[PDB]
Structure 1
Amino acid sequence: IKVRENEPFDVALRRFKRSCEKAGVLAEVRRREFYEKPTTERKRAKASAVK
């Protein structure tokens, strides 16, 4: 992640790489691994990944 873009202002843009990490890739971890719990949910979400 990098930021420079000149032009005087301070709108935001803190959403660029944002949607590629954030407290998401973090929340993805931090707590005990899933081991088997993923093979189920990660493959159970597909049930919805269709309709």
Structure 2
Amino acid sequence: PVIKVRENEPFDVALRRFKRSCEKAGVLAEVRRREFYEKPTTERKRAKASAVKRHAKKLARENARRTRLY
């Protein structure tokens, strides 16, 4: 999992951000772990789930203008 997609300009440290798009996730991540059939649909596919903390933050920005904390 140095990830086959080549890093822009080659260097001794791999640019792990610039490389992954959908590798390792779900396929080679749960190594030495119990495989489930249908749990992965709700267990791993968490892109909506992780957006909510960013939204919460983008809401509280506005309120800090109205409170005069900002």
**Which ranges in structure 2 are unaligned for 5 or more consecutive residues?**
53-70
TM-score normalized with structure 1 length: 0.30
Q: Which has the higher contact order (CA 8 A, sep 6+)?
A: 1
Question: Once the 2 structures are TM-superposed, how far is the Cα of residue 39 of structure 1 from its aligned partner?
Answer: 0.7
- Sequence identity (%): 100
Question: Once the 2 structures are TM-superposed, how far is the Cα of residue 46 of structure 1 from its aligned partner?
Answer: 2.8
Q: Which structure dedicates a bigger proportion of its chain to helix?
A: 2
**Which ranges in structure 1 are unaligned for 5 or more consecutive residues?**
none
Which of structures 1 and 2 has the bigger CA Rg? Answer: 2
Instruction: Classify 1:34/1:15 alpha carbon distance in 2 versus 1 (closer, same or farther; 3 Å).
Output: same
Count of aligned positions: 50
Moved over 6 A (4+): 1-26
TM-score normalized with structure 2 length: 0.26
